[PDB]
Design a protein around this ligand. Structure first.
Ligand SMILES: Cc1cc2nc3c(=O)[nH]c(=O)nc-3n(C[C@H](O)[C@H](O)[C@H](O)COP(=O)(O)OP(=O)(O)OC[C@H]3O[C@@H](n4cnc5c(N)ncnc54)[C@H](O)[C@@H]3O)c2cc1C
Ligand SMILES: Cc1cc2nc3c(=O)[nH]c(=O)nc-3n(C[C@H](O)[C@H](O)[C@H](O)COP(=O)(O)OP(=O)(O)OC[C@H]3O[C@@H](n4cnc5c(N)ncnc54)[C@H](O)[C@@H]3O)c2cc1C
Lengths: 316, 316
């Protein structure tokens, strides 16, 4: 059973992980990065990306990540194809257990992500990348002035609808319940846009199927009500599934301070912003950000973690 | 005298400004961006950039910014060539005074930057981009295993030397004073690396000239001591000028909360992180970051500001 030790170990091969790698590599820290199951993170599950600063045209999640990876390898970053299933961050050096073996480190950067949960329907699965999306901020502008649907029943859903109501010509919010479980402000604003605006509520409804053509989503089928099989079809260009995300932090339960599954970082404006509750352990990307959730913000925090780790490893 | 009004106004055409523009543009906020004197920010004053995530090869500050600008224009961002010389953020809408006219806005994003101050020497000026640099994190790896010099006498200088001492084969810290005015920890660590390490102190010295060849810096000339013209030449591959930066915040004095010239933002992990002391005014990039100072971090905060402004303008 192998036990490998590196000064700096990075977890995750998405934007956050790779950027942390290039900054640590160009800092001469000889970083080791564990890719995780999904090599490339969430971006590999997407098509066109037109909000990455500097790439106005022809970019895709896969292409961006391929470039990220190449950049990381150019600086001799040691890429290990594994996935951590257990850790002990209460002892030095830190110990992480994977499938290919165990790893130890003096400084750790967690960039494991927080992927979105979907409905699990076959039709929905068929339209992913071609109409079905999980991030309004990412694909919303594609549906500028077109009818759009958002399905969910909490803050995440209402937030998506609110953000889409200034971009789409219409926003159809769908939920199985009669009401939405979101914070009072969002509910008031949502109702303002409903009472006299861009939003059309579809409560007590279940998404039976996502329909469309060779180009993308063209409709969505809803049913249910109350003791009646009342069905209604909606013409829609896009479906934003907003039922929630799953921060990859199970392995960290009882080890780090978490907030709704997210790793809590020091944040602030005085340095050591990616620091977790444990001196020497840092977090970047989605796993520690539930507000912006962008590749650029993820790469920014990835950069910060590498620099924080550097200063930490240098006793500063 | 013209008074133009836009829902959202962005100040600065560096990474932070442009990224904020693409995120606001793709948010359908129809942003107006005032470029400032230096169109493109600090990156235009540089050559090779190999720490921008996704661009392992052939990138330059100018090329990155040209791409940033094109991305911003692709989404119909209104670019105005001006520079703000006065503002009033205590009234709504906000009022900013330029040279081409006055501007008003419902939400403002400040991404004015914080450029580095140099020594002002003719030789130094001659070697900028070819040996003389102002950011270790940016150009340090270029001098991996080579002799390097850093000139300054405070935290910024010592920090640069410390960061370079794990990358360069030698680090020559130069200052006109006998000691360094930095925080105790940095001084202890600096002395550890001096007593038994990578750093060679050159106190009570003045940089008389930066010398080099068609490829770059090859040396640096020092003089002074104490009542004696004692001169000493040093073979060095790079000179990092670390005497300080100048946050472009004069116009904001008495208007916003500042910290050593930097605009204080709310920060945190619960959203509205780029918010300044004034509801509706946001800051991104160098002007609000004196720790990382990277294009990627600047673009990240630029992204956040646009999203914070969006949520603000939407009454959330
Ligand atoms: C539909 C959709 C489209 C998108 N397109 C865009 C877009 O246009 N623009 C944009 O800015 N963003 C886009 N995103 C990406 C998104 O913004 C993410 O927030 C971003 O990828 C997060 O980066 P990350 O590095 O933090 O995490 P992730 O990309 O999620 O990567 C996490 C990495 O860590 C690994 N990992 C997980 N658990 C472990 C473990 N235990 N051990 C080791 N490794 C582990 C994973 O395998 C993976 O490599 C899109 C997202 C969605 C939902
Ligand atoms: C020697 C050197 C080399 C560099 N190369 C790299 C590199 O390889 N990698 C990297 O990550 N970073 C590099 N940088 C850039 C640096 O990291 C900066 O921190 C980055 O450019 C900051 O982005 P910004 O958008 O906040 O500000 P800036 O780029 O400084 O831009 C500020 C903008 O706002 C404008 N402005 C200022 N005042 C006003 C006003 N009153 N009204 C209107 N507009 C105004 C300016 O004209 C300018 O357009 C380098 C820096 C230096 C010192």
């Amino acid at each position: 059973g192998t036990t490998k030790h590196s000064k700096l170990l990075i977890l995750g091969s998405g934007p956050a992980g790779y950027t942390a790698a290039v900054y640590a590599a160009r800092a001469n820290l000889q970083p080791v990065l564990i890719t995780g199951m999904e090599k490339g993170g969430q971006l590999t599950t997407t098509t066109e990306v037109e909000n990455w600063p500097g790439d106005p045209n022809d970019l895709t999640g896969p292409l961006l990540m391929e470039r990220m990876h190449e950049h990381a390898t150019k600086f001799e970053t040691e890429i290990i194809f594994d996935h951590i299933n257990k850790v002990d961050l209460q002892n030095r050096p830190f110990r992480l257990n994977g499938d290919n073996g165990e790893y130890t480190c003096d400084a750790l950067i967690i960039a494991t992500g927080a992927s979105a949960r979907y409905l699990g329907l076959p039709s929905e699965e068929a339209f992913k990348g071609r109409g079905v999306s999980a991030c309004a901020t990412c694909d919303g502008f594609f549906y500028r002035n077109q009818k759009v649907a958002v399905i969910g029943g909490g803050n995440t859903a209402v937030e998506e609808a609110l953000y889409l109501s200034n971009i789409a010509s219409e926003v159809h919010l769908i939920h199985r319940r009669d009401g939405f479980r979101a914070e009072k402000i969002l509910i008031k604003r949502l109702m303002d846009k409903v009472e006299n605006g861009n939003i059309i509520l579809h409560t007590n409804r279940t998404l039976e199927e996502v329909t469309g053509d060779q180009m993308g989503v063209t409709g969505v089928r809803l049913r249910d009500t109350q003791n009646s099989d009342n069905i209604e079809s909606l013409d829609v260009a896009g479906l934003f599934v907003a039922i929630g995300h799953s921060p990859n932090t199970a392995i960290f339960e009882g080890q780090l301070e978490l907030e709704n599954g997210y790793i809590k970082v020091q944040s602030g404006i005085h340095g050591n912003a990616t620091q977790t509750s444990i001196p020497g352990v840092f977090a970047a990307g989605d796993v520690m950000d539930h507000i912006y959730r962008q590749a650029i913000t993820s790469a920014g925090t990835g950069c910060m973690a590498a620099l924080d780790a550097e200063r930490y490893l240098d006793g500063l």
